[PDB]
Amino acid sequence: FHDQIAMLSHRCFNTLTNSKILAAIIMKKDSEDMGVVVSLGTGNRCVKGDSLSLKGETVNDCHAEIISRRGFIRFLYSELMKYNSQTAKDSIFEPAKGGEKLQIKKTVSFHLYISTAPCGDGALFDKSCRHYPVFENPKQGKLRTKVENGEGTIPVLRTMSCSDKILRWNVLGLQGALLTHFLQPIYLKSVTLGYLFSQGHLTRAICCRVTRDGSAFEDGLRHPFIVNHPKVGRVSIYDSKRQSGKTKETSVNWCLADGYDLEILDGTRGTVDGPRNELSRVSKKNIFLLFKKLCSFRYRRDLLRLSYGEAKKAARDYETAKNYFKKGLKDMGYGNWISKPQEEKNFYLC
Amino acid sequence: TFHDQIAMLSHRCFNTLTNSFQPSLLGRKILAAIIMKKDSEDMGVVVSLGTGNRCVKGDSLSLKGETVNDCHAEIISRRGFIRFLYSELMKYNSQTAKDSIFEPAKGGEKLQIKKTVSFHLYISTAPCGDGALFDKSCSDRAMESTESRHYPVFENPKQGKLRTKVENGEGTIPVESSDIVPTWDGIRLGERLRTMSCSDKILRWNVLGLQGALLTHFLQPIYLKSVTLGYLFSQGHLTRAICCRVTRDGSAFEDGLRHPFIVNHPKVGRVSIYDSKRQSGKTKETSVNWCLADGYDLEILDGTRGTVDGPRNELSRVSKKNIFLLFKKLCSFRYRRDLLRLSYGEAKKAARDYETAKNYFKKGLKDMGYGNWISKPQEEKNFYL
RNA sequence: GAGCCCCCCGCUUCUGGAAGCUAAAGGGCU
Ligand SMILES: O=P(O)(O)O[C@H]1[C@H](OP(=O)(O)O)[C@H](OP(=O)(O)O)[C@H](OP(=O)(O)O)[C@@H](OP(=O)(O)O)[C@H]1OP(=O)(O)O
Ligand SMILES: O=P(O)(O)O[C@H]1[C@H](OP(=O)(O)O)[C@H](OP(=O)(O)O)[C@H](OP(=O)(O)O)[C@@H](OP(=O)(O)O)[C@H]1OP(=O)(O)O
Ligand SMILES: [Zn+2]
Ligand SMILES: [Zn+2]
Ligand SMILES: [Zn+2]
Ligand SMILES: [Zn+2]
C-alpha cells in the first residue's frame, strides 16, 4: 500500500520538475481509486533569529513536512472556494452536525509520505532496536527543538521538531486554527516513511507518546478532537548506502490548485529565490488573505474585523484543545512547548 | 630513551602476539605502543598495543556506548593503557604498596605515579593532522641531541589549525566555518561525521593526561615522556603538533592551567632508518588491541563499524560500556559509594578539576585562533546504563 | 586578484586492474 503512495509522490515530483528530501500529502477518494498527490514539498533548512519577521512575510520552517502541510492548507482553501450548492455532490465536503460547519466526507481520506524520518523523536534508535510504542528509557519521548545549521534537534526563537509538530497534527488536526471556523479537524489516515523507519519510536513519537500512562488524556479531550493513531508503514525496498551528498537549501512547494507553477524558497531566510525577494505564497500574509476572502465569500463579516491573532483566538474550541494538549504534554514530563510572542501574529492585512 | 629500542620492543611484542594467528594480519597496518620504564636499567616492557587506520560511520553510532568511535592505532593504544591502569589499581593494596607503580600523594585522597616510573609512546607513522603536512622527502636525519628544548616552526597561519577525519572523505580537513552542529538525529539523517585527528588528541593528552576523566578521581594526571616515530618525522612540525602549538603566543596559557594539570613536552625522536616499504594503497580496516593484563589475548575489531570483527558483533573490551563497568567495580572496591550511583556523563562531570581544565584548554585553543573542538552529540556521550 | 592542470592522501561502480567522487596541503602556466 505504501509503495503506491511513494511512487505517486515521486512521479508527481519528477513530472513537475522535468521542465532528495521530499514530503507529500495524498488524497484517496476511494479504496479502488489510486489517489492523487495534493500537496508537495521539499527542503531541510530552518530560518534563524535574524530572518524572523514580525509581520510574517517569511516561512519560519522550510522543512519538507511543514511545507507540505502549508500547501495542503492552501489546497483546502481552494476547495472551500469551489464549494457551492450545485457542486455539493461532486465535492469532498458535507454538512456536519448542527449545520454550522462543513466536514470532510467519510470516503475521502488523506495520507502523508516523507522520504526520511522526521527530526526529533523519530530517529532516536540504533541497529539494536495495533500500535506498539517503545518506552524503554526515561529520556525517550521528550520534546526537541530544531538547531540552527543542521537537520538535527536538541532536547529542551526556537522551533519544535518535525515529530512534535506531527504529534500536534495528530491531536489537533491538520487544518489549523483558521479553517476550524469552517471545518471539523482532519487527521491523517496513514504515515509512510522512506528512510529511517522504526515502528516503536515512530508510533511513540507521533501518536502514542500521550497514551503512555493510560487513557487519562483522551477523556479530557473535548469533542471532536481525538488522539488519532494513523497507520504507520514503510517502503518495501530501499536504497542501501545512506546518502551523504551535500544538499541545497532550496525549498520547492506546490499545491494541486497551482497547475505547473512551483515556488522556490531558501530555508536560511524563507523567501522566494530572487533578487526582488518576493513574498512566499505559503507565508502568513497569503494565508490570511485567502481566509479573509473565504470569510467575505461566506458572508461572515464578524471574522473580517479580527486580525490574525484575534481570528486565531476566536476559535474557542480549537484553542482550548491546544492548551489542554500542551498542558498534558507538560504534565507527563516532556518540557514546556515554546510559543512565539503574540506580537508576531498581531498584524493587520493592508 | 634510545628510540630504536622502543621500536624493536613494539614490533617484537606484535610479532610474538601474532606469530601464528590467521593470515589476515599480513596486510599493511599502522602500529602504536606504550612502553613503561621502571628505572634506569630497565630494558622496557610493552603495556599497550593498538592498530587500525579507520573510524566509524555516522550510521553505526550507538546510544548506549557499545561502539568505539575511532580505530587509529594511537587511540586504541591509549584505551589499552586505560585498561592497564584500571587493572593495576585493582591490584593495589596496603601490603603491596611498594611493588606497585603507585604511591600516596599529598593527603592520601588520590594516588599518583612513582617518580621512578615513566611512559613512552611509539607510532609507526606520523600522527594524522597537524603532524603530517610535509612530504616524505622532507625527512630530517636522526640526531642524538642531548638538549630537550623543542624547535617549533610556524611557517604559515594555516599550520596550527585543528582538523577532523571526515566520514567517506579523504584527507584531514580543518574545523571550517562549518557551523553544522553535531546532533544524533542529524547525523543519522545523513550529515557528515567528523572525528578529531590523532595529533589533536595527542595534544589533549599532553595538556590533560592519558588517564582520561573518570580515572582522575583516584589518580593525578599521567603524562608521557617520549614519542618515537617510524616514518614521516619532522621535528619542527611534530613538536608544534603535539605540545608547542599551545605556547606560541607566550606562557600566559601555562599559568592559567592549575596544578596537577600542566603542559607536557615529551622528547621527540625518530627511528634510525625507516622501512622503505610503505605501500600507499591496500589499507584494510581490521584493528587489533592488546593490554598487559590480557596476557596473550588480542581483540580484533572491524574499524568501520566499531565492534568486534565477527558475525555476532559482540561488545568490544575497549568500548565505553566496559570502561564504565571497570569504573563501577573499582568504585565498589575503594568504598566510593557516592560515585556508584551516577551515570557516565555525570560521573565524568563529577571530577570538577578535570572538567575545569578541559574546558579551559578548549577555550584557550579557540581564543588563540586554531578553531573549535568538535564534540559528539550529547545523546551519545551521556548514554544509558 | 582571476582562471587552468601536476603530483601524495577515505569511499562507490565494472584476485587484479580501470573509472568517478570526497576537500586539504605545496607547485607550475596565462
Ligand atoms: O508553520 P507551522 O510550523 O506549520 O506552525 C505554525 C506555528 O509554528 P512555527 O512558528 O514553528 O512555524 C505555530 O506555532 P508557534 O511556534 O507560533 O507556537 C502554530 O501554532 P500557533 O500559531 O497557535 O502558535 C501553528 O498554528 P496552528 O495552531 O493554526 O496550526 C502555525 O501557525 P501559522 O500557520 O499561523 O503560521
Ligand atoms: O577517541 P578517544 O581517545 O576514545 O576519546 C574519547 C572521545 O573521543 P571520540 O570523539 O572519538 O568519541 C571523547 O571525545 P569527544 O567525543 O568529546 O570529541 C572524549 O570525551 P570528553 O570530551 O567528554 O572528555 C574522551 O574523553 P576522556 O578525556 O575522558 O578520555 C574520550 O571519551 P571516552 O573515554 O568515553 O571514549
Ligand atoms: Zn525536520
Ligand atoms: Zn499511536
Ligand atoms: Zn591518524
Ligand atoms: Zn614541545
Altogether, the residues listed in chain A come to a count of 350
Quote the strand ranges of A150-238, DSSP E: 153-155, 190-193, 231-234
Contacts of A153 in chain B (CB under 8 A): 183, 185-186
For A253, the 3-state DSSP assignment is: strand
Between the alpha carbon of residue A164 and those of residues A121, A156, B85, the distances in Å are 8, 12, 46
Is position B13 annotated in a ligand binding site?
Answer: no
Between the alpha carbon of residue A56 and those of residues A46, A77, A292, the distances in Å are 15, 19, 16
Structure method: cryo-EM
As beta bridge partners, residue A146 has A153
Is position B265 annotated in a ligand binding site?
Answer: no
The arrangement of strands across the sheet holding B173-174 comes to B173-174, B163-166, B194-196
Q: Which residue of B has its CA nearest to A124?
A: B185
Q: Considering all nucleic acid strands, name the nucleotide whose C1' atom is nearest to the C-alpha of residue B303.
A: C10
Q: Considering all nucleic acid strands, name the nucleotide whose C1' atom is nearest to the C-alpha of residue B285.
A: C10
Q: Measure the CA–CA gap between A246 and A237, rounded to whole angstroms.
A: 23
Q: How far is CA A350 from the centre of its chain?
A: 27
Q: How far is CA B162 from the centre of its chain?
A: 16
As beta bridge partners, residue A104 has A93
Mark yes or no for CB contact A150/B379 under 8 Å.
no
Mutate to test the pocket of ligand 1, among A345, A346, A347 (most ligand atoms within 8 A of CB): A345
Residue carrying the nine cell digits 480549537: A318
As beta bridge partners, residue A255 has A39
For residue A218, which amino acid is it? E
Residue carrying the nine cell digits 467575505: A296
Q: Which of A127, A145, A197 to mutate to test the interface with B (most CBs of B within 10 A)?
A: A127
Q: Is A291 within 8 Å of A311 (Cβ atoms)?
A: yes
Q: Is A187 within 8 Å of A229 (Cβ atoms)?
A: no
Residue carrying the nine cell digits 585562533: B369
Angle at A222 between CA A219 and CA A224, to 5 degrees: 115
**Number of C-beta neighbours around residue A11 at 10 A:** 11
**Number of C-beta neighbours around residue A19 at 10 A:** 6
Contacts of B63 in chain A (CB under 8 A): 124-126
- For A160, phi then psi, to 5°, come to -55, 160
**Number of C-beta neighbours around residue B42 at 10 A:** 14
Q: Considering all nucleic acid strands, name the nucleotide whose C1' atom is nearest to the C-alpha of residue B174.
A: C24
Between the alpha carbon of residue B29 and those of residues A294, B207, B248, the distances in Å are 71, 28, 34
For residue B53, which amino acid is it? N
The CB-based long-range contact list for A210-215 (8 Å cut-off, 24+ gap) reads A210/A167, A210/A171, A210/A325, A210/A328, A210/A329, A210/A332, A211/A131, A211/A133, A212/A133, A212/A135, A212/A141, A212/A332, A213/A332
Chain B 148-177, CB < 7 Å to strand C: 155-156, 158-159, 161, 166-174, 176
Residue B47 backbone zone (phi > 0: left; psi -120 to 50: alpha; other: beta):
alpha
**Number of C-beta neighbours around residue A301 at 10 A:** 9
Q: Measure the CA–CA gap between A173 and A178, rounded to whole angstroms.
A: 12
- b/e sequence B123-143, b meaning 16+ C-beta within 10 Å: bbbbbbbbbbbbeeeeeeeee
* DSSP codes of every residue in B257-324: S-TT-----PEEEE-SS--S---SS----EEEEEESTTTT--EEEETTTTEESSTT----TTSHHHHH
**Number of C-beta neighbours around residue A61 at 10 A:** 21
Q: Measure the CA–CA gap between A349 and B30, rounded to whole angstroms.
A: 68
The CB-based long-range contact list for B206-209 (8 Å cut-off, 24+ gap) reads B206/B242, B206/B243, B206/B263, B206/B264, B206/B265, B206/B266, B207/B243, B207/B246, B207/B257, B207/B261, B207/B263, B207/B264, B207/B357, B207/B361, B208/B261, B208/B354, B208/B357, B208/B358, B208/B361, B209/B261
B254, three cell numbers? 601555562
Q: Measure the CA–CA gap between B160 and B113, rounded to whole angstroms.
A: 32
For A192, the 3-state DSSP assignment is: strand
- Domain ranges for chain A: 2-331
Q: Residues with Cβ within 6 A of ligand 2?
A: B 69-70, 75, 78, 195-196, 201, 212-213, 320, 348, 375-376, 381
B188, three cell numbers? 543519522
* Partner residue facing B168 (CB), from A125, A149, A244: A244
Between the alpha carbon of residue B38 and those of residues A18, B42, B79, the distances in Å are 73, 6, 21
Q: Measure the CA–CA gap between B326 and B87, rounded to whole angstroms.
A: 9
Between the alpha carbon of residue B312 and those of residues A343, B219, B307, B348, the distances in Å are 58, 36, 9, 30
Known active-site residue A310: no
As beta bridge partners, residue A233 has A192
Task: Give me the catalytic one of A65, A94, A249, A319.
Answer: A65
DSSP label of B381: H
- B304 C-beta less than 7 Å away from strand C: yes
Tell me how far the alpha carbon of residue A206 lies from the centroid of ligand 4, in angstroms: 7
Angle at A341 between CA A340 and CA A343, to 5 degrees: 130
Q: Measure the CA–CA gap between A267 and B256, rounded to whole angstroms.
A: 43
Query: What is the least distance, in Å, from the CA of B187 to any CA of chain A?
Result: 7
Q: Measure the CA–CA gap between A310 and A305, rounded to whole angstroms.
A: 9
Residue carrying the nine cell digits 500521550: A210
Residue B216 backbone zone (phi > 0: left; psi -120 to 50: alpha; other: beta):
alpha
SS3 content of chain B, % helix, strand, coil (to 5): 30, 15, 55
Active site residues of B: 74
Query: What is the least distance, in Å, from the CA of A209 to any CA of chain B?
Result: 18
Q: Measure the CA–CA gap between B313 and B337, rounded to whole angstroms.
A: 33
Strand bridging mode A250-255 / A263-266: antiparallel
Tell me how far the alpha carbon of residue A47 lies from the centroid of ligand 6, in angstroms: 45
A36, three cell numbers? 492523487
Q: Measure the CA–CA gap between A316 and A54, rounded to whole angstroms.
A: 24
Quote the strand ranges of B131-273, DSSP E: 163-166, 173-174, 194-196, 226-229, 267-270
